[PDB]
Amino acid sequence: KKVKLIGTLDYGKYRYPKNHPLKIPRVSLLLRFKDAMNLIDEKELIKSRPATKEELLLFHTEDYINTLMEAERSQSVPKGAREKYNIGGYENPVSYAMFTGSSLATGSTVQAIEEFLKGNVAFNPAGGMHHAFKSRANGFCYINNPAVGIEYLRKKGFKRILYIDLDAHHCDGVQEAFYDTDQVFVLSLHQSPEYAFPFEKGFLEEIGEGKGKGYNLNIPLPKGLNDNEFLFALEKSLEIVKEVFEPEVYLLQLGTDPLLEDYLSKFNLSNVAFLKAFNIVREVFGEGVYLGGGGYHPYALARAWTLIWCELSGREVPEKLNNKAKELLKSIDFEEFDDEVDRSYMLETLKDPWRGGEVRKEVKDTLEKAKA
Ligand SMILES: O=C(CCCCCCC(=O)Nc1ccccc1)NO
Ligand SMILES: [Zn+2]
């Protein structure tokens, strides 16, 4: 049983435009980081491969895929593509990330899956692009690696696939994709749609359609969410799943945006709570395929995913970051959103302190209605 990390420094060449949250290095940055912390070896890394047209078609429609391919190389927005495919906008602009990086991130999810099925443990930090629809770009996403991955498994015969999304936002793409089926159970904790993207979906009431009614569970959570609240809903919502679904396999997306320092989230979570959310899912359902997801703060991103890597890699977490790592992080131009909050403290340790607190009624009500 090997523990593999799927990645490449090439993502770093497929960034989104300056004015875009995804303009920064992310997975390429994770690799440089753990290499600087000496927490990864060559024999544990798997080079990302591009998803084949066929694999993408296990979910996405040809016209939508050909539109992506055409738009990228001509580096343009084709006539009627903006409207029909939600491509070209600020949200999902034209770039080399729209198809080449997306395909790369997607092939890595299948790679991650192939590995798991070989009896190994893999983590694909570039995957977890859960917003894309069958024929539409959405929320920075063009290709839905999770859906594509899940369909991959269905073709391999699995009939009870589980998907847990701990990313701060609802995986509306993953939801629409298996909303009418009961072979795939979709579960998601995220910022309530009442105040956060997607805004149009993610509400507790969305429990399915047809045979799938009861196989989609959304856990809308309040702003200022603290560690205890987060963990509370996880353990609690996982329970609802176990009494209703016996998984043959499950995927977990681990976006680091729920963390306190990430601006695209109103949650004030910590690394440790994040790490624990992870281990709790593993305690309940065993090992599964681990995916990446949203994350916009270079420091949180790096420290957080490094914890996941250590946990998997069975290696102790250095309590501090050596100089090579501190310098790396400081070399990235990110520009803090809130002028000066000062996040240099993140450079003084890998595991930050707990940010627990009481558990608001809201959360307990949310869970209770989800239970009922
Ligand atoms: O990370 C996500 C959500 C992506 C959608 C975020 C869109 C909102 C947006 O445009 N925000 C923004 C843009 C520039 C600078 C800061 C925030 N999925 O989990
Ligand atoms: Zn997110």
How far does the centroid of ligand 2 lie from the alpha carbon of residue 138, in Å? 12
CATH homologous superfamily of domain 1-372?
Histone deacetylase domain (3.40.800.20)
Give, for ligand 1, the residue of 170, 197, 267, 336 to mutate: max count of ligand atoms closer than 8 Å to Cβ.
Answer: 197
How far does the centroid of ligand 1 lie from the alpha carbon of residue 21, in Å? 7
Find residue 217's DSSP bridge partners.
187
Residues with Cβ within 8 Å of 123's Cβ and at least 6 positions away in sequence, in order, are 4, 5, 6, 112, 290, 291, 292, 308, 309, 312
Find residue 253's DSSP bridge partners.
165, 291
Compute the distance between CA of residue 320 and CA of residue 272 in angstroms, rounded to an integer: 14
**Ligand 1 lined by 197 (C-beta under 6 Å):** yes
Task: Please give the full DSSP string across 60-90, using - where no structure is assigned.
Answer: S-HHHHHHHHHHHHTTS--TTHHHHH--SSS
Find residue 188's DSSP bridge partners.
165, 218
Compute the distance between CA of residue 60 and CA of residue 45 in angstroms, rounded to an integer: 28
Short-list 128, 76, 120, CA closest to 102: 128
**Ligand 1 lined by 64 (C-beta under 6 Å):** no
Residue nearest to atom 7 of ligand 1 (CA): 139
- Radius of gyration of the chain from Cα atoms? 19
Task: Judge residue 308's burial from the number of C-beta atoms within 10 Å of its C-beta, 0-12 exposed, 13-18 middle, 19 or more buried.
Answer: buried
Nearest ligand by distance to the CA of 19: 1
102, 130, 305, 355 from 294: Cα distances, Å: 14, 9, 12, 21
Active site residue 170: yes
Short-list 233, 70, 95, 211, CA closest to 165: 233
Short-list 106, 128, 97, 130, CA closest to 17: 97
Residue nearest to atom 4 of ligand 1 (CA): 139
> What would the two tokens of residue 315 be?
């290696």
Residue nearest to atom 3 of ligand 1 (CA): 139
Q: Are 208 and 215 in contact (CB under 8 A)?
A: yes
Tell me the domain boundaries of the chain.
1-372
Find residue 164's DSSP bridge partners.
187, 252
